[PDB]
């Protein structure tokens, strides 16, 4: 009874440290999840029944995703290696179901967040300043590690409390996150996290309402627009780095980063228009480029990429209407389950559930924004981490919302 609670508490404490710092932390954490579910045998038959208002839109939405994503193979005879990455999105079901049975103490989750962020900062500092490395990621890919760091920092931004020390810890969370990201380059993730943290000031300070966020974003936008009045500072001449690219893309020459990205997006969204329901197939995006009439007349870099770099374009082109709906659902259904728990916690007082729901919503927003520039489905580490975190936060969120 109690032992499951204590071990689940220490596991949620150590999850960020295991994932970020420990090299093979994904396997260790997936073993920690298993050594909990294997302990409650007659449980979880009366735990699905208790939280079927939250569990079911985390099980049906993933089962439909898997079914639609494997129902492409019956005709599009691509090998099974494609569906080995979506085999890792089923882990969200398990990591939510285990938490639902074994009630944790999410007071330690935030302490784990800050400990993991500080230790990851130390590791990255060592790997950049001494063992000279261009892309100092701990033990995974640089982009996947950047996504991990952004998600951890945004979760930790929702510290429950209103006090000097709690605000200090919340601010240090984003400070460490931005230091880690800047040491790893990939400033796109930095700007995504910065724009995602602005709506989270709703959860951060429980005094600044919707108007005290609207005014803030208006001021920030005006400050940003103030740059072009004097186009000398680096602020003007980095968003002016793509003006030439787009104006050239509108002309004949398309051999630039923005130009290549837009050309791939158009060659994806025209094929999707030609094949509304089903596309080339699951994965297999290279067939569009290899069979188009643009790559037949030129050998630009856009004709050799394995997959597109836009989730809303890659999913639509490869799968089609059902695939686009299920891919959208995989992110939006959690976004609808977090709101329904946040409002319940708000109606119950219970600030911890409110902050947890805010953290979950921020994670969903950050995942969508990151997917607006890259395909998060390709990286196995990104997929497994997102599934684990989205199934772990909503577990305690539902636990706090109900009782």
């Amino acid at each position: 009874n109690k032992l499951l609670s204590r071990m689940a508490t220490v596991l949620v404490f150590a999850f960020p440290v295991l994932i970020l710092c420990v090299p093979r932390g994904a396997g260790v954490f997936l073993a920690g999840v298993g050594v909990l579910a294997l302990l409650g045998w007659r449980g979880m038959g009366r735990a699905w029944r208790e939280y079927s208002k939250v569990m079911t839109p985390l099980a049906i939405a993933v089962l439909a995703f898997m079914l639609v994503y494997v129902g492409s193979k019956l005709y599009f005879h691509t090998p099974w290696n494609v569906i080995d990455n979506p085999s890792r999105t089923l882990l969200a079901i398990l990591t939510c179901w285990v938490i639902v049975r074994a009630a944790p103490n999410p007071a330690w989750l935030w302490r784990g967040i800050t400990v993991g962020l500080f230790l990851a900062l130390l590791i990255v500092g060592y790997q950049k300043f001494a063992l000279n490395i261009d892309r100092p990621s701990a033990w995974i890919q640089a982009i996947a590690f950047a996504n991990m760091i952004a998600a951890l920092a945004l979760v930790g931004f929702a510290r429950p409390g209103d006090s000097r020390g709690t605000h200090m810890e919340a601010w240090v969370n984003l400070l460490l996150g931005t230091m880690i990201l800047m040491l790893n380059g990939t400033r796109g993730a930095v700007v995504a996290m910065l724009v995602t943290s602005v709506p989270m000031l709703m959860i951060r300070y429980r005094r600044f309402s919707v108007r005290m966020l609207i005014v803030a974003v208006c001021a920030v936008a005006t400050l940003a627009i103030g740059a072009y009045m004097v186009p000398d500072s680096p602020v003007s001449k980095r968003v002016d780095d793509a003006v030439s690219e787009i104006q050239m893309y509108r002309q004949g020459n398309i051999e630039t980063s923005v130009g290549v990205r837009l050309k791939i997006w158009h060659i994806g969204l025209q094929y999707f228009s030609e094949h509304p329901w089903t596309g080339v197939g699951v994965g297999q995006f290279a067939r569009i480029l290899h069979a188009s009439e643009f790559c037949h007349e030129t050998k630009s870099l856009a004709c050799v990429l394995e997959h597109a770099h836009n989730d809303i374009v890659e999913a639509a082109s490869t799968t089609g209407i059902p695939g686009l709906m299920v891919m959208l659902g995989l992110f939006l259904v959690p976004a609808v389950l977090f709101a329904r728990a946040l409002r319940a916690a708000r109606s119950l007082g219970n600030p911890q559930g409110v902050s947890l729901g805010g953290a979950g919503l921020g994670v969903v927003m950050a995942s969508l924004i990151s997917g607006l520039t890259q395909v998060t489905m390709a990286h196995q580490a990104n997929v497994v981490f997102y599934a684990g975190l989205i199934g772990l936060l909503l577990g305690m969120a539902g636990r706090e919302a109900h009782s």
Epitope: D134, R135, T186, D241, L301
Partner: antibody, heavy 119, light 104 residues
Framework: VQLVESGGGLVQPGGSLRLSCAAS????????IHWVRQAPGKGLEWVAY????????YYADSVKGRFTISADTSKNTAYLQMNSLRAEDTAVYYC????????????????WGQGTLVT | DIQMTQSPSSLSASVGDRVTITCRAS??????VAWYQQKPGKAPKLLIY???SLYSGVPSRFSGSRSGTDFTLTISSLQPEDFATYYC?????????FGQGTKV
């Protein structure tokens, strides 16, 4: 998209030389420009580069302390300034540009220059 | 720093016989090794980036793969224009390094 370099020639040891790597079709402040040299009848040897936006630079073991790489976004050109050359610095010097950061998170040289010979 | 070794340093094979080239590494570079082809008195051009992805204008004969820290390149078949020197560059460490350079 073309990269051209010039400035090489005959120089006695102990002197100095500057190479200008003019670029076209892109912005030097956007991507990163790498200098690389190849000894005659030998393999390629890296020397230095500059970062995309930050301007941070790294140098090879042999050329550190005397080679000065620089960029000028006003003229969209890159320069490598060498001081106190010895006889072991005779090689053909090439320009190099990495691919886009998104297509390759790790640096990979795609567009090069014609190269110049220094002796 | 990091030392890259290539084997064989120089090998010859007739047309139609596939040839493999191995690039080793002193330390662990995850996937930041690319391959270049240099013709005599000409600027080298990129062939494979991230050790497993082809570059534009490169025929599908060229292919690379990763096995731990021992990186290998192979060609489907040899055509008369494929006889040129090859190099491997590691980009994981901020101080990049080129290999010794094999010759076909």
């Amino acid at each position: 998209v073309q990269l051209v370099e010039s400035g090489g020639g005959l120089v006695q040891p102990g002197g100095s030389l500057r190479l200008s790597c003019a670029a076209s079709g892109f912005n030097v402040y956007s991507s990163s420009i790498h200098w690389v040299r190849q000894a005659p009848g030998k393999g390629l040897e890296w020397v230095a580069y500059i970062s995309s936006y930050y301007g941070s630079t790294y140098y090879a073991d042999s050329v550190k302390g005397r080679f000065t790489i620089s960029a000028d976004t006003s003229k969209n050109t890159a320069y490598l300034q060498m001081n106190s050359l010895r006889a072991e610095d005779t090689a053909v010097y090439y320009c190099a540009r990495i691919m886009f950061k998104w297509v390759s998170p790790n640096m990979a040289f795609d567009y090069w220059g014609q190269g110049t010979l220094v002796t | 720093d990091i030392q890259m070794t290539q084997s064989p340093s120089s090998l010859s094979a007739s047309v139609g016989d596939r040839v493999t080239i191995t690039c080793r590494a002193s330390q662990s570079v995850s996937s930041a090794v690319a391959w270049y082809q240099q013709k005599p008195g000409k600027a080298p051009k990129l062939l494979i980036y991230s050790a497993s992805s082809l570059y534009s204008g490169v025929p599908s004969r060229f292919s690379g793969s990763r096995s731990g820290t021992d990186f290998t390149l192979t060609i489907s078949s040899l055509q008369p224009e494929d006889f040129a020197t090859y190099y491997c560059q590691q980009s994981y460490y901020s101080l990049v390094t080129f290999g010794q350079g094999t010759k076909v």
